Scaffold this active site. Structure first.
Site, PDB file in Angstrom:
ATOM      1  N   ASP A 140      41.255  45.741  42.771  1.00 45.66           N
ATOM      2  CA  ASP A 140      41.037  44.698  42.543  1.00 45.66           C
ATOM      3  C   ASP A 140      39.723  44.324  43.831  1.00 45.66           C
ATOM      4  OD1 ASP A 140      41.170  41.049  42.673  1.00 45.66           O
ATOM      5  OD2 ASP A 140      41.685  41.833  44.655  1.00 45.66           O
ATOM      6  N   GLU A 174      37.993  47.025  39.045  1.00 47.35           N
ATOM      7  CA  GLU A 174      38.074  45.479  38.967  1.00 47.35           C
ATOM      8  C   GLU A 174      36.991  45.654  39.757  1.00 47.35           C
ATOM      9  OE1 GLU A 174      36.363  41.768  39.951  1.00 47.35           O
ATOM     10  OE2 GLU A 174      37.791  42.338  41.450  1.00 47.35           O
ATOM     11  N   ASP A 233      42.230  35.394  35.333  1.00 47.07           N
ATOM     12  CA  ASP A 233      41.076  35.093  35.853  1.00 47.07           C
ATOM     13  C   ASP A 233      40.547  33.783  34.891  1.00 47.07           C
ATOM     14  OD1 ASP A 233      42.000  34.949  38.724  1.00 47.07           O
ATOM     15  OD2 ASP A 233      40.806  37.527  38.961  1.00 47.07           O
TER      16      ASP A 233
END
Length: 488
Positions: A289, A336, A388
């Site tokens: 992340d 990511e 998301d």
């Protein structure tokens, strides 16, 4: 053709249609793995399994531990099988949205009752040894939080700063409560171990998710304060976020404490190494992340209401990943690398051969987008959409006329809104991206109502669950995987 070409589904455990208010690691998890296998999928992506709370909007990315598992994901029917609860303690709820409020209370009660009728404490002691590096601290953290009814930075100064003697005293005092919290972790990790074996024997690799930062209110900051930028009182000196975009007006203030990276380098990155080792007990791949934070991170002064007055601070990504790839040379990492990407970030990623992320939902705002199928290189994970984002069908509903034109021209025809998911799934599958991942909501052709998370908004998120028989989709998707050489 004999290339590495895999397909997977993005589906968080909570979204499973289990009968107890929320998805869990029981029957429906196994049914979903059976569906993966039957279709020819090789990948399953979940969100972080860390404990969630009402306070943090139930977000998997804001937890009081980066190591622990989330007790609401536990299958209570295993407790019935092991004679730790009675049949009447079990209580079905109809299939709907995740009932976080009620499952926090209900599953806590089932686990409190199970701990009373438990018995085999020798198995708990072996578990504690295996996880000694985090679990002693976490279970004690939870026991003290229970007693005082306060966060760690509000505790008496001696427990707050982890004075050796004070920790010993309070452990013996809350010994029974300490062991309840290890028991809860024991139950979780044993259920995941069983599920993981089931997946692995059927050739399914699990992609897990590592948040960049812990929350300030976590056992992790409590145990390793020097690893974060805090002042003399252990309050944050700087906090995390990202700068103003053309998307957002005033950026986002995440409110995590930032890393003191010079201290991580000083201790040979051993905390990060322990994070990776721990998570590889659970997962085959680790999605990193906010990967760009390893090159540079946005740092804003504590007390600020917005993230406007921050600055970019370089982090030692080159040194960190050189060591991580030496310890873990088979390379479990996925980046990511969406948003605030520079060439410095791309160079860091590609230097260590870490696959990036691409999302076809981002492909039609610009004619030469790197998220267009023909621009996606082999070393990438290619998503239809992510948690998301709105699912493709809901994204298409609100898509502007110009971006619609680009989409239609790419396909060579205008298509009806209900057929868009299929068309974009095909585009993702036909690509040369080594991993192609479909969000479950796209497989089920669901709209904006099935959106998992809306970034910026604090509450309402992480609630979507499967409500329908998704196995009816099996013949359609199986055929597609085989056509585009991703069926195994």
């Amino acid at each position: 053709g004999s290339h590495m070409r895999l397909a997977g589904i993005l589906l968080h455990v909570t979204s499973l249609p289990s009968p107890y208010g929320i998805g869990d690691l029981g029957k429906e998890a196994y049914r979903f793995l059976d569906f993966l296998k039957e279709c020819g999928f090789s990948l399953w992506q979940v969100l972080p399994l860390n404990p969630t709370s009402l306070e943090a909007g139930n977000s998997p990315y804001s937890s009081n531990s980066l190591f622990a598992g989330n007790y609401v994901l536990i299958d209570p029917e295993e407790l019935l099988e092991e004679d730790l609860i009675k049949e009447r303690d079990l209580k079905r709820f109809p299939l709907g949205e995740a009932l976080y409020e009620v499952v926090y209370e209900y599953k806590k009660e089932l686990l409190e009752k199970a701990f009373k009728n438990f018995r085999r404490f020798e198995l708990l002691e072996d578990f504690l040894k295996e996880h000694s590096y985090w679990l002693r601290d976490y279970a004690l953290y939870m026991a003290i939080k229970e007693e005082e009814g306060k966060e760690w930075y509000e505790w008496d100064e001696e427990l707050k700063r982890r004075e050796k003697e004070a920790l010993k005293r309070v452990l013996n005092k809350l010994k029974g409560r300490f062991y309840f919290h290890v028991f809860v972790q024991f139950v979780f990790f044993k259920q995941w171990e069983k599920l993981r074996r089931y997946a692995r024997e059927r050739g399914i690799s699990i992609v897990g998710d590592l948040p960049m930062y812990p929350s300030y209110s976590s056992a992790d900051v409590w145990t390793n304060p020097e690893l974060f930028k805090l002042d003399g009182d252990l309050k944050p000196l700087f906090v995390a976020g990202v700068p103003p975009d053309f998307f957002s007006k005033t950026g986002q203030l995440w409110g995590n404490p930032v890393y003191n990276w010079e201290e991580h380098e000083k201790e040979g990155f051993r905390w990060w190494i322990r994070r990776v080792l721990h998570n590889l007990k659970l997962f085959d791949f680790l999605r990193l992340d906010h990967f760009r934070g390893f090159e540079a991170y946005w740092e804003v002064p504590y007390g600020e209401e917005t993230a406007v007055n921050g600055r970019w601070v370089k982090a030692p990504g080159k040194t960190l990943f050189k060591k991580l790839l030496s310890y873990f040379p088979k390379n479990p990492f996925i980046a990511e690398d969406l948003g605030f990407i520079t060439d410095e970030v791309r160079y860091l990623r590609e230097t260590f051969k870490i696959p990036g992320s691409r999302v076809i939902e981002f492909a039609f705002y610009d004619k030469e987008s790197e998220h267009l199928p023909h621009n996606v290189e082999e070393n990438n994970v290619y998503y239809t959409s992510t948690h998301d984002l709105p699912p493709i069908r809901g994204w298409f509903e609100n898509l502007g006329e110009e971006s619609r034109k680009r989409l239609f021209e790419y396909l060579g025809r205008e298509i009806k809104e209900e057929k868009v998911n299929e068309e974009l799934i095909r585009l993702v599958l036909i690509s040369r991206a080594k991993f192609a991942i479909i969000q479950m909501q796209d497989l089920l052709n669901l709209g904006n109502e099935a959106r998992m998370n809306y970034p910026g908004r604090p509450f309402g998120n992480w609630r979507w669950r499967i409500k329908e028989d998704y196995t009816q989709k099996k013949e359609f998707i199986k055929k597609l995987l085989g056509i585009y050489g991703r069926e195994v």
